Design a protein around this ligand. Structure first.
Ligand code: HEC
Ligand code: HEC
Lengths: 126, 126
């Protein structure tokens, strides 16, 4: 759906910004600094689940650019494992949120965050 | 969820970029320049439905900035009508996509596009 590589870069950066917000906005809740309302978190996590599927199709062949490392494309099976593992960690978070279980939510949130960082360490410049 | 107004601006601009892509990528399909696969469009429109609910909470009080006109906030009931009417037009598109009806999809796509433009004309600078 992208006319130029820059359009795929803009798309993925936008998608990743919206993850970051739907992930990160739960930080005060998992820390107990903000109240836990199970319905509101269940709804937020379902938005995050949708968003978390979106960036990867905007790293298609030839869409080098942005802060993406060039190994995303030379190592496509490894990049695919990292995004699939991340999305699997999101499924854990969805199960916790759907269950209304704040201890499970806390644990799953930490696992998701570690999976963001695992990908960054391999595949994000800087 | 936004520490500064700039963070709400970045969020809404990202959300609106991802709409634009999930809307606009269907243009060749509604024109017949690309093939119509009912399942693929049904799935795309459900992403667009999720995305189309997101921008509006990032125009909260005091988040002036970007290319947003200042009337978004002085006229909050009118802005709310425009986003709700837009989302209602998205429901029409979802019904068409869920039905696998390309003529209904065409018509609903045009109505959605007109609703994007109606809001821009009132509320987007330039
Ligand atoms: C690989 C499988 C990734 C996972 C999982 C996550 N991120 Fe990431 N992120 C990735 C890359 C390759 C890039 C660079 C994209 C580019 O072309 O520039 C990023 C970038 C971000 C950004 C910045 C987006 C921007 O506005 O430019 C943010 C805010 C970001 N990533 C956040 C983030 C979070 C919170 C994640 C887990 C919830 C996450 N990312 C996972 C690669 C991958
Ligand atoms: C009001 C109820 C709107 C509707 C419906 C749509 N858009 Fe819009 N759009 C709106 C505003 C106020 C702005 C400016 C936001 C800001 O703070 O700068 C926009 C902006 C866009 C953009 C640019 C995003 C960017 O990267 O900066 C795009 C691509 C865009 N809008 C597309 C778009 C489409 C395709 C719509 C219908 C499917 C649509 N918008 C509806 C206000 C509103």
């Amino acid at each position: 759906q992208f006319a130029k590589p820059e359009d795929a870069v803009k798309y993925r950066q936008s998608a990743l910004t919206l993850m970051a917000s739907h992930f990160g906005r739960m930080t005060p809740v998992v820390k107990g600094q903000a109240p836990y309302d199970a319905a509101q978190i269940k709804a937020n996590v379902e938005v995050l689940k949708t968003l978390s599927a979106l960036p990867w199709a905007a790293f298609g062949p030839g869409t080098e650019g942005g802060d993406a490392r060039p190994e995303i494309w030379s190592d496509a099976a490894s990049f695919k494992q990292k995004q699939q593992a991340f999305q699997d960690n999101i499924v854990k978070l969805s199960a916790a949120a759907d269950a209304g279980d704040l201890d499970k939510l806390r644990a799953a949130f930490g696992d998701v965050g570690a999976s963001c960082k695992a990908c960054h360490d391999a595949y994000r410049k800087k």
